Design an enzyme around this catalytic site. Structure first.
Site, PDB file in Angstrom:
ATOM      1  N   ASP A 181      55.759 -35.399 -10.822  1.00 32.69           N
ATOM      2  CA  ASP A 181      56.129 -35.587  -9.287  1.00 32.69           C
ATOM      3  C   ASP A 181      57.380 -34.788  -9.025  1.00 32.69           C
ATOM      4  OD1 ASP A 181      53.778 -37.026  -8.668  1.00 32.69           O
ATOM      5  OD2 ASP A 181      54.806 -38.683  -8.294  1.00 32.69           O
ATOM      6  N   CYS A 215      48.495 -25.809  -3.405  1.00 28.42           N
ATOM      7  CA  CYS A 215      48.963 -27.162  -3.827  1.00 28.42           C
ATOM      8  C   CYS A 215      49.536 -27.907  -2.494  1.00 28.42           C
ATOM      9  CB  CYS A 215      50.341 -26.555  -4.623  1.00 28.42           C
ATOM     10  SG  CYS A 215      51.453 -25.474  -3.540  1.00 28.42           S
ATOM     11  N   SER A 216      50.164 -28.294  -2.260  1.00 27.76           N
ATOM     12  CA  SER A 216      50.719 -29.113  -0.530  1.00 27.76           C
ATOM     13  C   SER A 216      50.787 -28.219   0.277  1.00 27.76           C
ATOM     14  CB  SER A 216      51.477 -30.325  -0.795  1.00 27.76           C
ATOM     15  OG  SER A 216      51.440 -31.030   0.314  1.00 27.76           O
ATOM     16  N   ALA A 217      51.829 -27.103   0.351  1.00 23.86           N
ATOM     17  CA  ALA A 217      52.077 -26.310   1.291  1.00 23.86           C
ATOM     18  C   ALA A 217      51.621 -24.978   0.633  1.00 23.86           C
ATOM     19  CB  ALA A 217      53.628 -26.176   1.461  1.00 23.86           C
ATOM     20  N   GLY A 218      51.178 -24.691  -0.304  1.00 24.82           N
ATOM     21  CA  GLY A 218      50.557 -23.294  -0.682  1.00 24.82           C
ATOM     22  C   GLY A 218      51.560 -22.413  -0.938  1.00 24.82           C
ATOM     23  N   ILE A 219      52.800 -22.669  -1.279  1.00 27.81           N
ATOM     24  CA  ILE A 219      53.845 -21.681  -1.769  1.00 27.81           C
ATOM     25  C   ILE A 219      54.696 -21.794  -2.870  1.00 27.81           C
ATOM     26  CG2 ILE A 219      54.006 -21.225   0.761  1.00 27.81           C
ATOM     27  CD1 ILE A 219      56.878 -22.719   0.758  1.00 27.81           C
ATOM     28  N   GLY A 220      54.724 -22.963  -3.393  1.00 26.31           N
ATOM     29  CA  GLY A 220      55.669 -23.445  -4.678  1.00 26.31           C
ATOM     30  C   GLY A 220      54.800 -23.345  -5.870  1.00 26.31           C
ATOM     31  N   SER A 222      51.716 -22.848  -6.282  1.00 27.47           N
ATOM     32  CA  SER A 222      50.905 -21.788  -6.085  1.00 27.47           C
ATOM     33  C   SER A 222      51.560 -20.452  -6.232  1.00 27.47           C
ATOM     34  CB  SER A 222      50.284 -21.789  -4.433  1.00 27.47           C
ATOM     35  OG  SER A 222      49.362 -23.115  -4.156  1.00 27.47           O
TER      36      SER A 222
END
Ligand SMILES: CC[C@H](C)c1ccc(NS(C)(=O)=O)cc1
EC number: 3.1.3.48
Length: 282
Positions: A181, A215-220, A222
């Site tokens: 988390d 992922c959640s935002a698609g940048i980290g 991912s």
């Protein structure tokens, strides 16, 4: 500099935050005008994470073609990826429309549906074989075929049916379930094992459309996945593997989607993964 010794030099000098800020300063800035239109507000999870106009994936739809998703095309490595946000309640049908239209074989999910007590993406696939899902806005049906639960990840076989044409296709769902988390994993060993399982499935290969990763935002998270994959492929292709410059590869990928790698800890973890992975390849 080489990678493994540049790595120890940043650790000993404690300068990861400065290295990461340099990347943020040099990164490309391109317009994202379609993402910011008022009619698309409920298609974006985060107001500060948007696809660039020049690389965004277009839905094959004349009413509204928008989805928060980007095509990352790596020319030398000969790999492409679609990076996208975790689907929202009002974009699950768009998500599977994109998978269909782009001819993807695999979906890579790096988050849990709930993390830190809040919802990070919609429950967008079926959890029981006998309870299929129908997406009426895009005319698709999705069925769970089989599920294999392992200690660090789960693989699912899914059937996607285009209800307009009655065509069907097999999609593979690769779900990394153990990213913590807070922070990053202590060892890259389970993440690399997961990457190799995606590779072994055919989902990253040129005979299919680009893999969809989120992922959640698609940048980290991912960004960490595609950066590690591309760097390891270049180290296999080139005469001199020590010429692979992870910061330059990351800046190239940021020409196609903003914000890839969200923290200095994620940057350090990407170095660690590529370093350890290059030893196992040989
Ligand atoms: C859903 C689990 C099922 C047993 C399964 C299917 C496919 C694959 N991988 S692959 C790339 O097709 O070999 C692994 C597992």
């Amino acid at each position: 500099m080489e990678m493994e010794k540049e790595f120890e030099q940043i650790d000993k000098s404690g300068s990861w935050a400065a290295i990461y800020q340099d990347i943020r300063h040099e990164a490309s800035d391109f317009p994202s005008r379609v993402a910011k239109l008022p009619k698309n507000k409920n298609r974006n999870r985060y107001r500060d994470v948007s696809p660039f106009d020049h690389s965004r994936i277009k839905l094959h739809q004349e009413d509204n073609d928008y989805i928060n998703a980007s095509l990352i095309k790596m020319e030398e490595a000969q790999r492409s990826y679609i990076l996208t946000q975790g689907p929202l309640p009002n974009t699950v049908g768009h998500f599977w429309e994109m998978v269909w239209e782009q001819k993807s074989r695999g979906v890579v999910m790096l988050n849990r549906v709930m993390e830190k007590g809040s919802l990070k993406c919609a429950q967008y696939w079926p959890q029981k074989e006998e309870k299929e899902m129908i997406f009426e806005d895009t005319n698709l049906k999705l069925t769970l075929i089989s599920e294999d639960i392992k200690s660090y990840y789960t693989v699912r076989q899914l059937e996607l049916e285009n209800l307009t044409t009655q065509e069907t296709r097999e999609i593979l769902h690769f779900h990394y379930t153990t990213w913590p988390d807070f922070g990053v994993p202590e060892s890259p060993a389970s993440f690399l094992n997961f990457l190799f399982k995606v590779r072994e499935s055919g989902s990253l290969s040129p005979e299919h459309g680009p893999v969809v990763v989120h992922c959640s935002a698609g940048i980290g998270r991912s960004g960490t996945f595609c950066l590690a994959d591309t760097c390891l492929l270049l180290m296999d292709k080139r005469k001199d593997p020590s010429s692979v410059d992870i910061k330059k590869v990351l800046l190239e990928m940021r020409k196609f989607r903003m914000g890839l790698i969200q923290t200095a800890d994620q940057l350090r973890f990407s170095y660690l993964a590529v370093i350890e992975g290059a030893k196992f390849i040989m």
